[PDB]
RNA sequence: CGCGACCUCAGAUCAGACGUGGCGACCCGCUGAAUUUAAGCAUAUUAGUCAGCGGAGGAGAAGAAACUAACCAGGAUUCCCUCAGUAACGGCGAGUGAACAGGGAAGAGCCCAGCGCCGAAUCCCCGCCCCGCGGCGGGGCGCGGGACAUGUGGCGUACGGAA
RNA sequence: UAAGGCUAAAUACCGGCACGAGACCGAUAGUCAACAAGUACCGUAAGGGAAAGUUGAAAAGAACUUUGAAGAGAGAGUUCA
RNA sequence: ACCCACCCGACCCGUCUUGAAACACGGACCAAGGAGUCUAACACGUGCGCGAGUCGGGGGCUCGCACGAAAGCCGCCGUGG
RNA sequence: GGCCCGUCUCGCCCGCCGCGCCGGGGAGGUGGAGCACGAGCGCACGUGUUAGGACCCGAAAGAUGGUGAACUAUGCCUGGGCAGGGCGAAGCCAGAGGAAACUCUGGUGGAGGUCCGUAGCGGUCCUGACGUGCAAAUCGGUCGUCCGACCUGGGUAUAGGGGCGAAAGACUAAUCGAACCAUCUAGUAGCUGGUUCCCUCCGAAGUUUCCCUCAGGAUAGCUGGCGCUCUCGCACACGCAGUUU
RNA sequence: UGGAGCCGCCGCAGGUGCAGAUCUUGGUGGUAGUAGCAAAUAUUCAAACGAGAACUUUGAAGGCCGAAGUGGAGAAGGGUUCCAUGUGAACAGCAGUUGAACAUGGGUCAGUCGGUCCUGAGAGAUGGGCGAGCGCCGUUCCGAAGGGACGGGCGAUGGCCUC
RNA sequence: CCUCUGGCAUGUUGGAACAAUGUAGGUAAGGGAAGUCGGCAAGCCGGAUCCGUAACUUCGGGAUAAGGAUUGGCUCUAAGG
RNA sequence: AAGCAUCGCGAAGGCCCGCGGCGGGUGUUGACGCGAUGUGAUUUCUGCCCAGUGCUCUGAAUGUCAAAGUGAAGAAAUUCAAUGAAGCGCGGGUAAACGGCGGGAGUAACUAUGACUCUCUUAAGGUAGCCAAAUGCCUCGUCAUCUAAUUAGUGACGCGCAUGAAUGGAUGAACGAGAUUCCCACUGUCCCUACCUACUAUCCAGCGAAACCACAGCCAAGGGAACGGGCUUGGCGGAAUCAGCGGGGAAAGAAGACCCUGUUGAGCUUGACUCUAGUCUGGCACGGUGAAGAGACAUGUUUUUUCACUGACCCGGUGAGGCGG
RNA sequence: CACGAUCCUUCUGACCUUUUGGGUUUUAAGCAGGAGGUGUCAGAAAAGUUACCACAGGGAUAACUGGCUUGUGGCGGCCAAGCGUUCAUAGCGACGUCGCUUUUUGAUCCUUCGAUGUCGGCUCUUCCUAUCAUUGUGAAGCAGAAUUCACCAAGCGUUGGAUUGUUCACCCACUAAUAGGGAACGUGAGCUGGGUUUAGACCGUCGUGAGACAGGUUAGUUUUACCCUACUGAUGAUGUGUUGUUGCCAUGGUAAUCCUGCUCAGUACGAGAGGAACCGCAGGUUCAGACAUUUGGUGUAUGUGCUUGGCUGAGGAGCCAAUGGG
RNA sequence: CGACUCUUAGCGGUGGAUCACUCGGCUCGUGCGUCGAUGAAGAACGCAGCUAGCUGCGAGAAUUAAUGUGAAUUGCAGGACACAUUGAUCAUCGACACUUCGAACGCACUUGCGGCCCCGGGUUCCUCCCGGGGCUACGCCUGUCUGAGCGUCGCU
């Protein structure tokens, strides 16, 4: 399926 | 977790010792009747320059006392050896430079190098570059001699041993600075894989006792067993007194 | 410094034999975990189990008691039923765990070393003849070799045996 | 009665050769595999590993005419279809 | 029962949830596949046979088994449970 | 009430081939999954509870045995490659001065992990392009380095708790804080998700105590099912209640 | 419609009923004739062939690569891609009269160019050692590790037994 | 950067337009970092000759420091074998 | 990285590999070497602390300390005794080993600070230096400077939450796609935008995907799992589409990296609990010969100590070439 | 209330049982009662770390928003002891008391953990008023000027910079004024990424250590729109028989703003110092809508010169150098 | 009515469910129970008139011989044969044959180098050269031959 996101880059990131 | 450098110079392969280019093995002449009883003379055809050793080696060519064939040797030139000189060695050699006789009949005094630790061993001691041994004193009884090596340890062995009169060529090779990383780097390529070295500090905590911390700092004591399984025996080993 | 016995050892494209790999359901010999269970886990358990290595046969292994028993006693091995989820083991927890007797399937018993007696009475290989030859055998005949007394063959082996 | 040895039988058998049967499955099932399957294909390699059965009784599988460069059609014909 | 009209009613299912139309998750659509099984052990309930007995295995005797790998029988009927 | 077995308390008598540290009884308590004119055995079906892949699907892991250094890491062997400029180190020459020591001036010389800068090697910034791309990391401009710890082909060595690492836990075939392949394996899950026809009747719980128990079990409770024993609207009733007196 | 088997009742048996599982396999929609077919300056005119030309070929013109090449030759890797003739179904993200597509045939000639021989880093048998074992270590180390040569002698045969 | 030898047909298509957004290039009056986290981005600078060159310094450097001037075309002259 | 500095080792050795070997790597090596650490050119320095944790040195003078061996009683299993290795303890050394390095009071003829004095305390009590640093909480520290204006920059100050000497301190030319601050120049970075070019987007011929999708698709308020496209009450609603656009679909992406639970894991650590390769020591075995003597018990036995010997065993050398008489 | 199961150990008890072919004796095993303890007390034997991290799940549970709440913060009343030379209330207001608000922060845990992109700034629209300025007014302890207090009122405004990632803060400068707020703490398929908040590293403190630090520092990938809707513009649609024309207007939207100078006037007022206002006139700010005569910018008319390197043998005429340069 | 959209039906497409078949599996059982240096299993390369794959075979290569059978084989060709004849075709399979690797065997894996005996061309044993044939692995057993040792003896 398609890449989207990098491995590193985690979307919705919210810590 | 990780074996440590160290561990895996033993296994070799990497860390095995570069050795195409070097002349040959740089012993002394073998015992026989020659050598026992009188002296065997014998030429030094050239001297030589051998890769990863300081000190240089000549190719001296005697004849073989029972076929007719010219043998050759190399030795470790002793400081003042040159091209088209004689050297002789022997019981009834002469304490001349560059002219191995046995440390019994050499006097007290006698410097001397390529020295036999074990007599007939082909010379084993004092044989680096500007290094030498000194013969103490003799114990004719037990047929016994007392050698000074280049470590300052005083050391026991059997008159019948023999050394090369003389330094060892090639003196004060270490007075140089190397300055550049590359000098250091062309010295130990000729040698083996031990060159550019990390420190086990700089190491994460799996490859070294020493690593890991968010402070390059050791964290326990640099000092260790020597009775200490191979992998923590680290740092300074069965250190006696560790400072300046 | 010879020649000759033997003894121990070599070398042969010496004569003639054998072994080597495969397969691997079943079988024999080692080796040997961990998931797992214990509501955690380390002993235990999973399990002498999977994986690993070796060696077989049409079957293998086992087998003619250094056995069971404690009876008024049975009598090689193997297999089935039962004994028995028992006696026992076990952080006596989880769990594990046989045997004897009894009834069946089948049923078969033997040979050496030794101790002894018998002219080594024994064996292998050569070579010539008669038969037989697609599982190399019989009979005869050879001062033809060797093996063998550091022990071959017959009798004989605990149920007793020999004379 | 140990520290030597042999021994058929009842017993085992998801490999092999050759057979028989089934309250089984019936082509996304049943073996990975009803078919040119350990095939094609992938992976450096160890290894992984498919899909894919059916015209009709018989090929009688559409002569011939015509449109079109042809593929394609329109009539004609075969067939119980 | 096919379509259309009108009035009234009427939020999307499945699901976990005290509480789902939810700004909770799964779900574009259709076909086929697809999940409480089998073995063992116990327990209680129920049906049948026999009853201080009951029992069947395991074995054996009766057939080349077409149906049978059944069916029948056994001072084995009871070693034994 | 009684009997049997254990156990205690108290007591008095019997028995004989063996008279004894023998054997046998009695009365009264008390432990027993006991007896007190038997109900089991076999088979079948159902429900429940387990052990098993165990309703179906689901880990992160763990183990055994093998395949890889064609990428990349490092060593070794043998080959190949690196315009044009700048700075101008030692050495050398001349001349001038110096009383000597030696010093100045002009040349020559071409040193260096030296500078600029091409090919090569790299990959700073634009947080530029692209971002279902040309591309599972590419493109442009701009940059770092460019005789050395330089770049590079082939050969060869090191293999998985192992290698290799100028050290970033980096790299080890798009995979690395433990590679890949097959097996053990349907690994285990107190946790997500799902779990297939109709009608009919009954119909809950979130409270109890215990638990390395608090997203789970156990045990009571609440539910259903199966029943049985009796009762009498068959002129002819006893007992029971989420009352009241 | 289809063209060969199928049902009722009484019993027995089950791999027995689907809407969901980001379920499995196969198929199809809306999105949509949409996003898109924009890196590296460039095309134009005529004729030919042909059913058919923006794209084939020939000619003419204009352009680029600009000897660190978009030129001419090799290594590794590919494996017939090479060359010719024919086809226009499919493929070559428009087209095609074209192609590295498809179908027919053709094509690689060595004493001297390379493999081949040598040793390199290394790999690796035997002896020896270890090893339950498949094996491993080891490569000069715990080896009786040379089968060759010359000259002389003696024997044997093959040859104008002369040499 | 331009050309010959040799090689190509603009990199998987064409045509017609010349809107917005973009991607890639340019230019801008007056001001000159007021922009922004930040001179990010771009722009200045650039070659050679001739002058001229600071602090500091490990006395090597710093150094193309900084800061200036000149540069075309044509016709001659002189100097180097 | 050079430079500096520690440590081990004279080869039956140090360090290291390996399941095993009279195995192997360093090593074709021998201290100007091999191995193990730290710091990080030059310059200039490198203070005190050996109490703690490490490391190491010595060892019948000696607490404990195992198996075997020795004696003891016992019918025997046995128990009891003495004996006693390393290691612990005991005693020295070691900081360029890990590391560590203070707190009150009073005091100077204006005040203030405090040279000075008093204590209490450690193993010393932070020395040289250096500083609101990449280290300072308070903090936008104070003073200066830089600006019209400075939570920034520089220079000073030092009271230093919590600086400081090879855990290196202080320095420092040259160098840096390193981190800041200011100035000159230059500029569309901005005031404040405009115009131009190419390739797109746009329209056509030809060709032609994907993600995503319960149904769908206008709002306000209400209530509702406390922010509705749908429900209630209102506003309202007109085919089919084009180019744009980024408000909303709590848009797409990926069974939340955060957080918490799980009796689920891994990587790493150590004073966790349980083990283990390795290593150190003791015993028995291969293990022999002779000499001497010495105690202990007993009135021969055991313990053996030391010194030889060589035949096992080991090592080295060699083409095993002259060995001992 | 002052305490503890199995297993194990220990002690005590009886002319006790067993110790297995029989017998004697040691030993061991039983039977029955104490004791040795599990305080997580119905009873495993057990330390850390992870920013290198992983898996199953959880809105049963935090870190936003949004709900409720409003202590705390903000804003506003009542009462009136006082202040205000005098006089409670022009302007204030103690001791007490009643409220509102959700632009503070807490409580809380309802929603979301098969993820609603986590601070600021920039950009843009709209809404509120608790009104800083401007319009019209009431008040004064309002002579004038300056002014605070209050009312209608949100039409129009509310800036440029220095430091800081900041919000906030402060300062400079201008101004009529430099009022305060909301919109998922408006606004990441709008940007940016300076900061928080992965991985690299440095320092200090803490930790034996791995490592930790709402302690400091530096380096660090910001994806997708072509769907629906919304909005912006663009074709069209049903009707009117078809077609054109010129028109009306339902409904939507909507816009203007504030200032300076002159004059009134050194006038009113005022002891003086100082010092207004209405009507006029001249202009400007911000905003809006246009336009290109002029000035400027652009410029590939590739218009016309000029020029570098090359290329057509040269002249001439030209071309190439991704727009050769100017 | 107009286009579009929605619904329903008819026909047509797309797609391949369902049903019906089954030279295949799965399970249970019976009998036998056999590989290899005389070269296995496996691998490779070859072989057909037209043949790629599968299958079958080995330079005698879709098979030879033999035996049984008794007219085909067949996609098309072509043929054979007298099918009153060992005789088409199948089956069986006892004779014969069986390329190269592979335990794999002269040594190496290039398909490279060899040694030693015999034979034909080549010579006229002249060795060369070419071609052909047969030997040339390791281990171990019985014997055989040649040997070794300051191993243990004897005689000289
Ligand atoms: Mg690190
Ligand atoms: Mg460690
Ligand atoms: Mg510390
Ligand atoms: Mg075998
Ligand atoms: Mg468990
Ligand atoms: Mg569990
Ligand atoms: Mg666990
Ligand atoms: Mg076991
Ligand atoms: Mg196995
Ligand atoms: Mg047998
Ligand atoms: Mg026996
Ligand atoms: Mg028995
Ligand atoms: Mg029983
Ligand atoms: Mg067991
Ligand atoms: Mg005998
Ligand atoms: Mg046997
Ligand atoms: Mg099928
Ligand atoms: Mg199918
Ligand atoms: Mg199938
Ligand atoms: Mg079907
Ligand atoms: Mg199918
Ligand atoms: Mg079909
Ligand atoms: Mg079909
Ligand atoms: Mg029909
Ligand atoms: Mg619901
Ligand atoms: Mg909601
Ligand atoms: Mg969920
Ligand atoms: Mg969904
Ligand atoms: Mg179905
Ligand atoms: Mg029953
Ligand atoms: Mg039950
Ligand atoms: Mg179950
Ligand atoms: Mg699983
Ligand atoms: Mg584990
Ligand atoms: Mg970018
Ligand atoms: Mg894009
Ligand atoms: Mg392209
Ligand atoms: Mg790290
Ligand atoms: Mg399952
Ligand atoms: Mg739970
Ligand atoms: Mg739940
Ligand atoms: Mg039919
Ligand atoms: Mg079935
Ligand atoms: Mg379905
Ligand atoms: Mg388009
Ligand atoms: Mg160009
Ligand atoms: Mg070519
Ligand atoms: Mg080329
Ligand atoms: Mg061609
Ligand atoms: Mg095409
Ligand atoms: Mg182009
Ligand atoms: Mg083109
Ligand atoms: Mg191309
Ligand atoms: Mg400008
Ligand atoms: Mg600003
Ligand atoms: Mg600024
Ligand atoms: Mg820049
Ligand atoms: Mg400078
Ligand atoms: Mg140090
Ligand atoms: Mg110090
Ligand atoms: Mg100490
Ligand atoms: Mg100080
Ligand atoms: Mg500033
Ligand atoms: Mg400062
Ligand atoms: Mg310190
Ligand atoms: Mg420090
Ligand atoms: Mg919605
Ligand atoms: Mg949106
Ligand atoms: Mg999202
Ligand atoms: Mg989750
Ligand atoms: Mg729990
Ligand atoms: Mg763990
Ligand atoms: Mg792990
Ligand atoms: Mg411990
Ligand atoms: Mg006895
Ligand atoms: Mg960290
Ligand atoms: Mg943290
Ligand atoms: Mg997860
Ligand atoms: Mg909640
Ligand atoms: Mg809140
Ligand atoms: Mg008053
Ligand atoms: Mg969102
Ligand atoms: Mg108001
Ligand atoms: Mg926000
Ligand atoms: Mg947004
Ligand atoms: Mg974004
Ligand atoms: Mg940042
Ligand atoms: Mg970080
Ligand atoms: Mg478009
Ligand atoms: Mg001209």
């Excluded at chain 2, 280049?150 to 019948?160: E, N, Q």
């Amino acid at each position: 399926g398609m890449w989207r996101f990098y491995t590193e880059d985690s979307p919705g990131l919210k810590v | 977790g990780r074996v440590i450098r160290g561990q895996r110079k033993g296994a070799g392969s990497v860390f095995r010792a570069h050795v195409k280019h070097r002349k040959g093995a740089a012993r002394l002449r073998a015992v026989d009747f020659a050598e026992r009883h009188g002296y065997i003379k014998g030429i030094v055809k050239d001297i030589i320059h051998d890769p990863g050793r300081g000190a240089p080696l000549a190719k001296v060519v005697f004849r073989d006392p029972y076929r007719f064939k010219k043998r050759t040797e190399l030795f470790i030139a002793a400081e003042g050896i040159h091209t088209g000189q004689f050297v002789y060695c022997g019981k009834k050699a002469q304490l001349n430079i560059g002219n191995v006789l046995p440390v019994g009949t050499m006097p007290e005094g006698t410097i001397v190098c390529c020295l036999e630790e074990k007599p007939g061993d082909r010379g084993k001691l004092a044989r680096a570059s500007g290094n030498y041994a000194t013969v103490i004193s003799h114990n004719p009884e037990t047929k016994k001699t007392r050698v000074k090596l280049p470590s300052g340890s005083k050391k026991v062995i059997s008159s019948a041993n023999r050394a090369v009169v003389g330094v060892v060529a090639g003196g004060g090779r270490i007075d140089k600075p190397i300055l550049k990383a590359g000098r250091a780097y062309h010295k130990y390529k000729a040698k083996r894989n031990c060159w550019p070295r990390v420190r086990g500090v700089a190491m994460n905590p799996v490859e070294h006792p020493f690593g890991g911390g968010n402070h390059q700092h050791i964290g326990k004591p640099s000092t260790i067993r020597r009775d200490a399984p191979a992998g923590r025996k680290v740092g300074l080993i069965a250190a006696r007194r560790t400072g300046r």
